[PDB]
């Protein structure tokens, strides 16, 4: 009868004395080792004193699991562990000082997201995500990638979108201070100012150009006509500007990083462009550099702190 530890968070460990003549499943319910489902398996001898993840089956474990993951979804742990079983076999090469991912299991959108997350200021609310984000920044990204899959409700090999992935992660981040003030000018209706907070204050869909957003973009007015929307005030450490992919020129020093998407809707591949002392293009493990870039861009990230318009 070996001594093991059970946990939902790998911080609070609970000593258990297990029966060597019963499965982990019979004694604990769903039980995992480093991602590997061992519910239907007897305790070996080299399992002695090791840490097992369990599905929460008492109040203490349910509270610990919510405090760590910020979800009570009973499927979360099994989806996280199933993802981790693959993400632990991925390769996380250091490319131009950034942790990337070698191509596997349609993971280009995760590699692009992971590269982006290393270049923008973001604090995650769930300790599971914040802890794994620090570990990923230091080169140990397998756990973080499995969490991103579980929080986005995506499995390994499923096709993914960087913008949708960033949106889910931002909904799990402290963006409460982020504020965006917009003005809409219609010939007829006149001027209406609106204030957005959190995720809606940092994401925009319809133009890649932060400068064009400051000048004004044409949107339909509920009245019928076309109106100009422009940015009045921005308080955030970054903005994400997205549009359906189109040929776009990226200028060294005018943006932080960008998502390149080649191919048809739900049938293409991401590469990541980052502005350093020159432009670096990261394609999983592969790196190329050039002074200029023109290609199909769908996301551009920019630095911000505080912007106020000069438009009266």
Ligand X SMILES: Cc1c(N)cccc1C(=O)N[C@H](C)c1cccc2ccccc12
Of 47, 108, 131, 257, catalytic: 108
Asked if 8 touches Cl ion (CB under 5 A), the answer is yes
Question: Is 189 annotated as belonging to a binding site?
Answer: yes
CA 259 – CA 112 distance, rounded (Å): 7
Which x/- pattern, by CB under 5 A, does the window 31-50 give for Cl ion?
--------------------
125 binds Zn ion, rule: CB under 5 A: yes
Q: 145 a known binding residue? A: no
25 versus 127: smaller Cβ distance to Zn ion: 127
Least gap, CB of 84 to ligand X (angstroms) = 22
Query: Residue 310 interacts with Zn ion (CB under 5 A)?
Result: no
C-beta separation of 242 from 112 below 8 A: no
Residues 212-241 that bind ligand X (CB under 6 A): none
- Of 108 and 273, the one with the shorter C-beta distance to Zn ion is 108
Length of the chain in residues, anyone?
A: 312
- Considering the complex, what minimum distance in angstroms separates the CB of residue 248 from ligand X? 13
Instruction: Read off the tokens for 234.
Output: 């921005």
- 152 as an active site residue: the answer is no
56-66 burial, b at 16+ Cβ within 10 Å, e below that, comes to beeeebeebbe
Does 188 help bind Zn ion (rule: CB under 5 A)?
A: yes
Q: For this structure, is 269 an active site residue?
A: yes
C-alpha separations of 184 from 99, 178, 205 in Å: 41, 20, 16
Note whether 129 and 87 are within 8 A (CB). no
E strands, the chain, are 3-7, 14-17, 31-33, 36-37, 51-54, 94-95, 98-99, 179-186, 190-197, 203-205, 217-220, 226-235, 238-251, 257-262, 269-275, 279-283, 286-290, 292-303, 306-308
Toward Cl ion, which CB reaches closer, 178 or 227? 178
Residue identified by tokens 């020093």 is: 253
Binding of residue 261 to ligand X (CB under 6 A): yes
> Per CB under 6 A, which region of 40-48, 263-271, 282-290, 304-312 contacts ligand X?
263-271
Q: Look at residue 78 and give its three-state secondary structure.
A: helix
Alpha-carbon Rg for the chain, nearest whole angstrom, is 23
To Zn ion, the closest distance from the beta carbon of 126 in angstroms equals: 6
- C-beta atoms surrounding 263 within 10 Å: 11
What, of Zn ion, Cl ion, ligand X, none, does residue 271 touch, CB below 5 to 8 Å by kind? none
Identify the residue among 154, 172, 229, 271 touching Cl ion (CB under 5 A).
172
Q: Which residues have a catalytic role annotated? A: 108, 269, 283
Binding site for Cl ion (CB under 5 A): 7-9, 12, 64, 70, 103, 106, 108, 125, 172
């Amino acid at each position: 009868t070996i001594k093991v530890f059970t946990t939902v968070d790998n911080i609070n460990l609970h000593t258990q004395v297990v029966d060597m003549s019963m499965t982990y499943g019979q004694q604990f319910g769903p039980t995992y080792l480093d991602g590997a489902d061992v519910t239907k398996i007897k305790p070996h001898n080299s399992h002695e004193g090791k840490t097992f993840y369990v599905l929460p089956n008492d109040d203490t474990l349910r509270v610990e699991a919510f405090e760590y993951y910020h979800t009570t979804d009973p499927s979360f742990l099994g989806r996280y562990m199933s993802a981790l079983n693959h993400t632990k076999k991925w390769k996380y090469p250091q490319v131009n000082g950034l942790t990337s991912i070698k191509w596997a299991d349609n993971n280009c959108y995760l590699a692009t997201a992971l590269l982006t997350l290393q270049q923008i200021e973001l604090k995650f609310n769930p300790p599971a995500l914040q802890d794994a984000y620090y570990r990923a920044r230091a080169g140990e990204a397998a756990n973080f990638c499995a969490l991103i899959l579980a929080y986005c409700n995506k499995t390994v090999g499923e096709l993914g979108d960087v913008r949708e992935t960033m949106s889910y992660l931002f909904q799990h981040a402290n963006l409460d201070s982020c504020k965006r003030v917009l003005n809409v000018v219609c010939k007829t209706c006149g001027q209406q100012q609106t204030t957005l907070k959190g995720v809606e204050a940092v994401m925009y869909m319809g133009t890649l150009s932060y400068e064009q957003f400051k000048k004004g973009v044409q949107i339909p007015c509920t009245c019928g006509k076309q109106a100009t929307k422009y940015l009045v005030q921005q308080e955030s450490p970054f903005v994400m500007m997205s549009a359906p992919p189109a040929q776009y020129e990226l200028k060294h020093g005018t943006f932080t990083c960008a998502s390149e998407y080649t191919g048809n809707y739900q049938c293409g591949h991401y590469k990541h462009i980052t502005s350093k002392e020159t432009l670096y293009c990261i394609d999983g493990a592969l790196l190329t550099k050039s002074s200029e870039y023109k290609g199909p861009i769908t996301d551009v990230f920019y630095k911000e702190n505080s912007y106020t318009t000069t438009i009266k």
